[PDB]
Each structure stands twice: as structure tokens, then as C-alpha cells.
Amino acid sequence: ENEIEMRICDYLRRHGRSTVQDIFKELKLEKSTVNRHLYSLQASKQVFKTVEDNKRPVWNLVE
Amino acid sequence: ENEIEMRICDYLRRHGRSTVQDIFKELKLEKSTVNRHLYSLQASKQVFKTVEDNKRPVWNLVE
Amino acid sequence: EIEMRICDYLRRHGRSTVQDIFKELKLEKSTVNRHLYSLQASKQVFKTVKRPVWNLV
Amino acid sequence: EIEMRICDYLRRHGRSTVQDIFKELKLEKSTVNRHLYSLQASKQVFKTVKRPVWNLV
DNA sequence: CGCGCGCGCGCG
DNA sequence: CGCGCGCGCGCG
């Protein structure tokens, strides 16, 4: 859903750098639902992630 | 939700042995939501699983 | 054991897709891939890319 | 390297919880556990149970 | 189409 | 409280 993606981006716009944990717990969505859209949004260059070895990816808006 | 668990058990009652795949695709729920309740239902002895090494667990009602 | 058979296929045929390997060895694609990625971690095999192509060392 | 330090702690102190290990080694619990379970798979260490307790061989 | 994935995990 | 988990994976 576009609505889910809107809410994910709005969360990132409000909070900045975040793991899937911060996002899904706040939005009250499944972790998997959020990750699906995070990786989808990464593909369309709307979000980006940084990953330290063996750590949860950290996400933020490209803008 | 109890409703989710009801639907999972009803699926199993109708179809018998199933992986999380069969269930979540039919119920239109996230795989994680279904697995959460499967493992919860396993704990309360309402469902059981069999697992061949390196394969998806197969689930069925205890009854 | 499975890893032995995989490395042996590679040792004989060289560059191979997972498809080449599982077809010959009569094994599940997922099984062969699980072992290839573990062998990759072991620095025993490597892939080129997808349709990855695998080979020894 | 981390696995070296873990096995060395075990070699010196014997039966240890992940808590014992990470506190001494100054490492994340998740890091130590990831390596213990890999060493378990390697048949290098084993656990008794939870609060698992770990030791060599 | 890359896929190795089992995973439930929320955990502080 | 066991937790190692990263995981997005839907894939045929």
C-alpha cells in the first residue's frame, strides 16, 4: 500500500536515522511489512540504508 | 488477535498439513503474523509441527 | 558429504551454475545453494555474477 | 579473532555463561552469542541448559 | 529470478 | 529472557 509507504517516510522525515525496530514499533505494523517497503523504497531511491557489519541496517530519507 | 488464531486453525481444519506458506498466502496475512500465532498455538498444545532437517516446518491441528 | 560432492563436481567441471550442479547431483536447488554459500564463507568456492556462476578456491 | 578470544576465555575459566564472556571480553552479547553458536556448529564448543552454559569441545 | 531463508524474536 | 536474527524472499 502507498499509505504504508507514506507513513514510513513520514516517520523517517520526523525522526531521521532509524532501524526497522523503531519504525514498526511506532507505526504498529509488522516488521516484515515495514522491511518490504523499506527495501522497495531503497530500490526507487527514496530511502537509503547504512549497515555496519553484523548490525541492523539504519535507514533514512534520501531527501 | 483471537480472530487470526481462529482463521489459522480453521485453515488447518479444512486443509490439514500445511507450511506457513500455504496459510499466509490463503489468509492474506503476513508470514510473520502467521508464524507468531503458529508458535503460540504450539505452546498451548493446539497445533503441532514436524520438521525434516533444513525444510519448512509442516503444521497441523492437534485435534 | 553434500559439500564433498559439490566441490567434486566443481573440481571436475569448473565454472558451474547452481542449475548445472543440482541437476547432475540429483539435489534440491535450495540444498545446493545453502552449501555453496557456506563454502563461500569458508573461502572454498567463489561466485561470479545475476545467475551466479560458481567455482573452487 | 573474536572466536579465538572466546575459546581462550573458555580454555582458562571453563563453564561460562554468555554474560561471563561478554563482560570480560568487552563485547556485545549478540556478538558473543553469534560466535558461540557458530563454534557449536563447528563442534568446538557445547552448551548445557535456559541460561545456557558454554564450554570447549 | 539474484534466493542461501529456518525466523516465531518482542529482548531493554 | 531461551535470542544466535541480518530476513526484504513472493520463487513455481
Author numbering:
A (entry chain B), B (entry chain B): 7 to 69
C (entry chain A), D (entry chain A): 9 to 57, 61 to 68
What does the paper say about this structure?
Unexpectedly, several fish species encode a PKR like kinase in which the two dsRNA-binding domains are substituted by two Z-DNA-binding Zalpha domains. PKZ interacts with CpG repeats, the DNA sequence that is more prone to adopt the left-handed helical conformation of Z-DNA. The protein was crystallized with an oligonucleotide forming a self-complementary (CG)6 DNA duplex with a single T base overhang and resulted in crystals belonging to two different space-groups growing under similar conditions.
The asymmetric unit of the other (hexagonal) crystal form, which belongs to the P6122 space group, contains a single 12 bp-long DNA strand and two DrZalphaPKZ monomers. Our structure reveals interactions with the second DNA strand involving Gln27, Phe30 and Lys31, whereas Lys37 is positioned in the middle of the minor groove bridging between the two strands. Also in this case, the monomers positioned at the edge of the DNA are missing these interactions.
